[PDB]
Amino acid sequence: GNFDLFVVGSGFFGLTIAERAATQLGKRVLVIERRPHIGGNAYSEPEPETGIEVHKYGAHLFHTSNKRVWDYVRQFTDFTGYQHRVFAMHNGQAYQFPMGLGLVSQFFGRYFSPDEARALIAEQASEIDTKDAKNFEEKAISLVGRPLYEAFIKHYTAKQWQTDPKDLPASNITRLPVRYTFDNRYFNDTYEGLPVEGYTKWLENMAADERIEVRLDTDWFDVRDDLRAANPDAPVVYTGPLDRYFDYAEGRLGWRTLDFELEVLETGDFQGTPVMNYNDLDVPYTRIHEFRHFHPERTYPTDKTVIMREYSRFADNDDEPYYPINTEADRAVLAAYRARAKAETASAKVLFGGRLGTYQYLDMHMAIASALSMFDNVLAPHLSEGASLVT
Amino acid sequence: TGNFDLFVVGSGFFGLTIAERAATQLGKRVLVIERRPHIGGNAYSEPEPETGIEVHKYGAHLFHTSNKRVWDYVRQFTDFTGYQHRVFAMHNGQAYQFPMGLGLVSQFFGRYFSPDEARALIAEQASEIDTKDAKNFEEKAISLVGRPLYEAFIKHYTAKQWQTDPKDLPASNITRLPVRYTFDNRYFNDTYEGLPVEGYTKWLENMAADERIEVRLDTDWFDVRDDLRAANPDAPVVYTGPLDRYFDYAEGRLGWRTLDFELEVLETGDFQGTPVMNYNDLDVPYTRIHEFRHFHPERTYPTDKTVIMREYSRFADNDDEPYYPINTEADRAVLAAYRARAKAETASAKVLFGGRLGTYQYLDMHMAIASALSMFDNVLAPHLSEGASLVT
Ligand SMILES: Cc1cc2nc3c(=O)[nH]c(=O)nc-3n(C[C@H](O)[C@H](O)[C@H](O)COP(=O)(O)OP(=O)(O)OC[C@H]3O[C@@H](n4cnc5c(N)ncnc54)[C@H](O)[C@@H]3O)c2cc1C
Ligand SMILES: Cc1cc2nc3c(=O)[nH]c(=O)nc-3n(C[C@H](O)[C@H](O)[C@H](O)COP(=O)(O)OP(=O)(O)OC[C@H]3O[C@@H](n4cnc5c(N)ncnc54)[C@H](O)[C@@H]3O)c2cc1C
Ligand SMILES: O=c1ccn([C@@H]2O[C@H](COP(=O)(O)OP(=O)(O)O)[C@@H](O)[C@H]2O)c(=O)[nH]1
């Protein structure tokens, strides 16, 4: 078989690339996936007992303000009207979350108006200006104030990262909306929803073109030399972990990984909301997912439910990495791997993309936007005009 | 102009649904007679001068429906925003998630209650009174949600709404009083909702737009009907004004509650961070405060000013606008008498009675529109198109 393009990894970055090359240029694409399933961390599957669709790697919520991405993804799936909301469990109480008049009134024990809340938080955040903040801890404190930081941010962050907050990226906290209204949407984007027929169906729709071949249970590094030899003109888009690609030659990047405990309970409803964060040090998990709440429109049992406890730890050499940590030390090692990546692009026509491929904290919509850009601006001209990958 | 096929009295959503359907679906000429200086009844909206913020001066209007036919119908006249209504409740100086659900329950009882423990808690508290033995509104409420939640969020709010001790209100007043056993605080349960993108008045004007519809404002039907009907004798009348006034209050006066509003512009960009705040306590005279900028987040409103509207409830005296039917036993008897008079009037004078005022029934917008579409399909359109009897 002949191929015009190799894609390593079948997550949203890889499949966006594969779909674009196949449909927009008529190219033959081989997608190589080491896991037994498609879709990267966005993969979903039914829990056998209940038939409830489970997100295998914990809740995945789609949201974007990029209309071009919204138009693109709607070609492969419809979306529900779901809007994500998260509650935070702290000292035995469930709190409205994230930062907003709900959290403020609950935590400080009486109603604060928008102007009263702004004044309160300003005093409590005064040790640092959001302008000046050098790191996660400083930025977080500057936005929500020290008391709310100590209660809802500090120990959740310790569990999720096991890394000094002063050495975590400031951009980690700005993922969360900061409001002085009673709005408690977890995201602040124009479009959001869940795929009506689930994530796995969406992903399979992206790989549906007959010019796309997907090989699961296959490690690129075991098969690449013979594949490339048989198709030497084909470039490669790699979306596996960046340090692993170069056999950790420049050091090991710090990654976090997750373990899950899935449980079917003999009640119809465990927590009354899709995601409950556990912000205290006294429980091992960071949050519990209850998946029935994502799809009320489905034929789900009324006397059973599936929940999933999420636990975070360091990615060892055995594990598969889920989160880039990006300490200052990580960033120096990153700079070395970026030099290696650019060299491999020039020498071996290998492009690097995605959360793992670029060591970036990317959501689905970010990964898809990035892949659309790579295709239009870099890969398509190489594939169809023989333009250089060295732009 | 003229040569009217149909008279419609009142230009609220019920009357305008009737007029628009008769005009566009049957090609009939309609005269809409409206005693107010504007169309739309209480759904009429307008800009507050100082801020430019769109307000609903007859009361806050939130649109919602679970009927797809009604949804598809109203979308011919307006687009809708993605607004979802949510309400918060102020009690003893704290803001609560509302309606009663796991959020409120956790806040009020001082710790997290799971769906199962909340269910057990409410069942235990509700068991103080058997619902069958409930002798009034207060006992029935307690028998459904338990004494703490009743006394915190229902008792005094109800007292301010009806200006009456809930002990003196009938158990009949209460159909269901659910506590939600999830954290869902979307106020309405309906499938479709949103605010009209260009506001209610523009939506209403679009319903009245067909050239076969003529509208006469500042005009009382009873001043003009005799000569109008003489000139157009077989045009039926769809009357959506007060049922008792129609018959000169001959069977008594139907009891209604009214609302007073106080509109105020404040020198802050945001007064309460949410569209509607209920005030559950006896220590403030208003039931609710509306902040209209939050009805339309998508608009560019002033960053340093806001308009709020305090709402007050009381019995509607003779010069007051009637809002909600009281429905005492005496009222229901007065209503039965007028219902008989109305049926006789439909037979002898071809007058149909409809809408909130014409039927002594509170109707939401989508209820009124659904009711008018039903009257049209079942009664008025077969009459206008085939000469079918209006008596059913
Ligand atoms: C716990 C977690 C929760 C998340 N929640 C959200 C959310 O709520 N909303 C949102 O928008 N995004 C969320 N994301 C991000 C999302 O899962 C993806 O990271 C995002 O879609 C980016 O996709 P990707 O293709 O870049 O990477 P990936 O999804 O990781 O796909 C990379 C693929 O490369 C494969 N691969 C790796 N090495 C090899 C190799 N040698 N050979 C062959 N194949 C290989 C991997 O098996 C993997 O399938 C979450 C991610 C994680 C880990
Ligand atoms: C405070 C208040 C708040 C409301 N909030 C909501 C909400 O949040 N969501 C929702 O869906 N609905 C709400 N509604 C209901 C909404 O107003 C509906 O559009 C209305 O009930 C529709 O019924 P209608 O058209 O028959 O009533 P109306 O809107 O009252 O129309 C009746 C019309 O008949 C006119 N009229 C009366 N007598 C005469 C006469 N002799 N001659 C000529 N004209 C006459 C009246 O001036 C009026 O314009 C609210 C209603 C009120 C009063
Ligand atoms: O209850 C919470 C939620 C988030 N965060 C911080 O915000 C970061 C991003 O939160 P997100 O909800 O985006 O994390 P993900 O779902 O990507 O694991 C986390 O890593 C934490 O450091 C926190 O401290 N407490």
Side-chain angles (χ1 to χ4, degrees):
Chain A
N2 287 296
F3 302 107
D4 298 304
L5 172 71
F6 299 108
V7 176
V8 187
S10 65
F12 275 110
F13 196 101
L15 292 189
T16 297
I17 294 295
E19 181 276 332
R20 288 288 85 181
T23 66
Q24 306 298 290
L25 299 175
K27 303 294 172 185
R28 293 165 162 101
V29 188
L30 177 58
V31 179
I32 300 296
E33 172 58 65
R34 64 166 279 150
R35 283 178 179 170
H37 66 80
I38 205 183
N41 286 324
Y43 176 77
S44 63
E45 61 188 336
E47 190 285 312
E49 191 164 338
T50 62
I52 293 172
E53 187 157 30
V54 167
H55 305 167
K56 186 185 170 66
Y57 304 89
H60 270 62
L61 300 315
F62 188 79
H63 58 102
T64 184
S65 295
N66 184 323
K67 178 61 150 71
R68 177 157 99 94
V69 169
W70 186 235
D71 290 346
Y72 174 71
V73 297
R74 283 187 298 165
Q75 293 170 308
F76 309 100
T77 184
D78 296 323
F79 286 92
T80 69
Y82 181 81
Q83 296 165 351
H84 197 44
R85 284 176 170 83
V86 167
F87 286 79
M89 193 75 71
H90 167 57
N91 283 342
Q93 178 64 291
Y95 289 85
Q96 298 167 86
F97 199 72
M99 176 61 191
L101 295 188
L103 179 64
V104 168
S105 56
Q106 274 192 264
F107 184 75
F108 295 103
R110 63 131 164 127
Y111 169 61
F112 286 74
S113 72
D115 289 331
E116 289 157 8
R118 275 180 186 284
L120 180 72
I121 299 303
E123 153 58 10
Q124 291 172 358
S126 58
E127 49 183 272
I128 29 177
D129 276 16
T130 305
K131 162 28 200 170
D132 308 331
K134 343 286 309 176
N135 60 52
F136 177 76
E137 173 161 281
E138 293 185 6
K139 194 77 157 194
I141 292 172
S142 73
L143 290 170
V144 303
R146 194 168 264 286
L148 282 177
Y149 174 72
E150 306 271 5
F152 295 95
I153 304 307
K154 193 144 167 189
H155 296 139
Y156 184 98
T157 297
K159 293 201 282 175
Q160 166 58 3
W161 296 106
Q162 289 178 294
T163 296
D164 169 22
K166 298 179 181 64
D167 203 11
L168 289 175
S171 67
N172 280 10
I173 196 61
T174 52
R175 293 172 56 83
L176 279 56
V178 176
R179 306 191 179 95
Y180 290 95
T181 66
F182 278 100
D183 193 348
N184 70 326
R185 291 190 55 170
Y186 202 66
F187 303 117
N188 198 40
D189 283 307
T190 307
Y191 314 105
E192 101 174 80
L194 296 169
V196 171
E197 301 200 335
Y199 282 99
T200 287
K201 184 63 177 190
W202 174 3
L203 290 149
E204 281 172 341
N205 280 348
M206 296 183 66
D209 195 272
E210 63 181 300
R211 284 258 192 276
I212 297 173
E213 178 181 353
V214 181
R215 293 181 190 172
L216 304 174
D217 303 292
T218 306
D219 199 307
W220 179 238
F221 301 113
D222 295 331
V223 293
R224 56 175 177 174
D225 289 351
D226 290 341
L227 288 175
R228 295 261 254 159
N231 302 276
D233 293 336
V236 176
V237 177
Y238 173 79
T239 71
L242 177 56
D243 51 2
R244 171 156 192 240
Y245 185 91
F246 297 100
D247 195 16
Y248 307 96
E250 309 300 324
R252 293 184 126 86
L253 296 160
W255 310 82
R256 303 289 290 173
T257 189
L258 303 177
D259 300 321
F260 305 95
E261 288 179 18
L262 182 147
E263 187 170 4
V264 178
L265 302 178
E266 301 296 330
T267 177
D269 196 345
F270 170 77
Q271 64 187 18
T273 198
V275 178
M276 183 74 72
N277 282 4
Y278 282 76
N279 299 68
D280 299 345
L281 295 167
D282 76 330
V283 304
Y285 41 86
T286 49
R287 59 191 162 193
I288 299 176
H289 314 279
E290 187 173 13
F291 294 97
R292 68 176 304 125
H293 300 294
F294 285 140
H295 291 285
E297 77 280 2
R298 290 183 183 171
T299 315
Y300 284 172
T302 55
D303 59 351
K304 296 176 175 186
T305 192
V306 59
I307 67 166
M308 167 178 293
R309 290 173 298 270
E310 177 172 315
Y311 310 82
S312 173
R313 68 187 164 74
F314 285 108
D316 305 330
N317 312 155
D318 266 6
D319 302 324
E320 300 297 305
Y322 293 3
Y323 296 83
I325 301 178
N326 275 293
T327 64
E328 203 165 70
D330 288 320
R331 289 179 199 254
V333 175
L334 181 56
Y337 279 121
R338 285 177 171 163
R340 297 299 303 262
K342 286 180 92 55
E344 184 78 340
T345 296
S347 299
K349 309 314 186 287
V350 177
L351 294 177
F352 290 79
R355 175 175 284 217
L356 306 183
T358 65
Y359 192 73
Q360 294 298 297
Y361 194 173
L362 304 185
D363 297 327
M364 291 178 277
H365 68 292
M366 305 167 77
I368 295 165
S370 173
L372 292 177
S373 180
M374 171 178 290
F375 181 76
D376 288 350
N377 298 323
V378 180
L379 184 58
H382 174 76
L383 286 175
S384 63
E385 337 169 13
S388 174
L389 296 171
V390 187
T391 66
Chain B
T1 54
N3 298 340
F4 298 115
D5 302 297
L6 176 66
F7 295 108
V8 179
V9 182
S11 63
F13 270 114
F14 191 102
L16 291 184
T17 296
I18 291 296
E20 180 279 331
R21 290 287 84 178
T24 69
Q25 301 308 290
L26 311 180
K28 302 297 173 168
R29 297 215 57 96
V30 188
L31 182 62
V32 178
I33 302 291
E34 172 57 59
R35 64 175 326 198
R36 292 182 177 182
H38 61 80
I39 67 173
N42 296 317
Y44 175 81
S45 68
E46 60 189 300
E48 188 286 312
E50 194 176 335
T51 60
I53 293 166
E54 187 156 32
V55 306
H56 318 158
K57 275 185 108 162
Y58 299 98
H61 277 59
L62 290 311
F63 184 78
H64 55 102
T65 182
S66 280
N67 184 318
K68 180 172 187 290
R69 186 198 189 200
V70 170
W71 185 238
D72 290 346
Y73 174 70
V74 300
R75 279 189 315 167
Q76 297 173 298
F77 309 103
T78 185
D79 299 327
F80 290 90
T81 68
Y83 181 91
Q84 293 179 356
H85 196 46
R86 281 174 162 78
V87 171
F88 286 80
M90 194 77 68
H91 170 52
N92 285 341
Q94 178 61 297
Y96 288 84
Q97 301 165 82
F98 197 77
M100 293 173 179
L102 295 187
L104 181 148
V105 163
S106 299
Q107 286 188 255
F108 183 77
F109 293 108
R111 66 170 172 88
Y112 167 65
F113 288 77
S114 69
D116 286 332
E117 197 181 353
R119 277 184 185 279
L121 177 75
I122 297 304
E124 172 65 28
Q125 297 179 350
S127 83
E128 175 187 350
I129 300 178
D130 274 294
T131 302
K132 282 188 283 209
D133 309 329
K135 298 186 183 206
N136 50 63
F137 179 100
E138 174 158 294
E139 295 186 5
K140 185 145 180 195
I142 290 175
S143 81
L144 290 175
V145 301
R147 181 174 295 269
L149 290 189
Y150 165 75
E151 296 185 336
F153 298 102
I154 295 174
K155 187 173 178 184
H156 300 306
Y157 185 79
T158 300
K160 287 193 286 184
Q161 272 184 326
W162 295 73
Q163 305 264 256
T164 317
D165 188 327
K167 279 177 166 194
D168 295 330
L169 278 46
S172 81
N173 264 31
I174 301 177
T175 35
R176 23 208 182 272
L177 272 177
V179 180
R180 301 177 174 183
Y181 298 107
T182 72
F183 283 97
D184 167 42
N185 71 326
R186 193 182 168 167
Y187 191 73
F188 298 115
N189 296 304
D190 284 322
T191 301
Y192 307 100
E193 91 175 281
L195 281 144
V197 170
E198 297 299 328
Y200 284 101
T201 289
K202 180 66 180 198
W203 169 5
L204 292 155
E205 284 171 341
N206 285 345
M207 291 184 73
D210 191 271
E211 75 191 354
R212 281 154 304 197
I213 305 170
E214 303 182 46
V215 177
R216 286 228 99 249
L217 297 180
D218 303 295
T219 304
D220 184 352
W221 176 239
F222 300 103
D223 290 329
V224 298
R225 63 172 171 177
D226 288 349
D227 281 351
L228 271 174
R229 297 205 73 185
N232 308 274
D234 298 311
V237 177
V238 175
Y239 175 78
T240 75
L243 176 62
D244 49 353
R245 174 169 195 242
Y246 185 97
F247 294 101
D248 299 319
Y249 305 103
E251 311 295 333
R253 309 193 179 229
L254 291 161
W256 293 79
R257 284 147 46 215
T258 192
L259 297 176
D260 293 323
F261 303 105
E262 297 192 354
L263 204 75
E264 183 175 4
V265 177
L266 301 175
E267 302 295 328
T268 178
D270 198 343
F271 168 81
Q272 68 187 15
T274 202
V276 182
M277 182 73 68
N278 290 1
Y279 280 77
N280 298 83
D281 299 338
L282 231 45
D283 68 342
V284 297
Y286 42 85
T287 46
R288 301 192 284 200
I289 298 185
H290 310 280
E291 188 173 9
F292 287 103
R293 70 175 305 121
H294 297 297
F295 287 56
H296 288 280
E298 80 279 355
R299 295 184 181 171
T300 303
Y301 280 154
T303 74
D304 63 326
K305 293 180 175 174
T306 192
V307 50
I308 65 164
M309 190 172 83
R310 287 174 300 272
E311 170 177 321
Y312 310 81
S313 179
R314 64 186 168 83
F315 183 89
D317 297 316
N318 299 287
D319 67 305
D320 292 324
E321 299 275 9
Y323 285 55
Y324 312 95
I326 296 175
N327 265 306
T328 67
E329 177 171 351
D331 283 322
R332 296 190 299 272
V334 168
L335 175 65
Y338 283 125
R339 285 248 198 81
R341 304 281 247 110
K343 300 200 213 75
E345 184 75 347
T346 298
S348 68
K350 267 168 56 152
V351 181
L352 301 179
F353 293 76
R356 198 173 50 85
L357 302 176
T359 65
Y360 192 62
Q361 177 180 20
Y362 174 74
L363 300 174
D364 279 329
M365 293 178 274
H366 69 296
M367 299 177 71
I369 292 165
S371 184
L373 292 175
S374 174
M375 172 179 287
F376 188 74
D377 291 342
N378 288 110
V379 181
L380 186 63
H383 178 70
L384 294 172
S385 293
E386 311 287 348
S389 167
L390 291 175
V391 182
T392 63

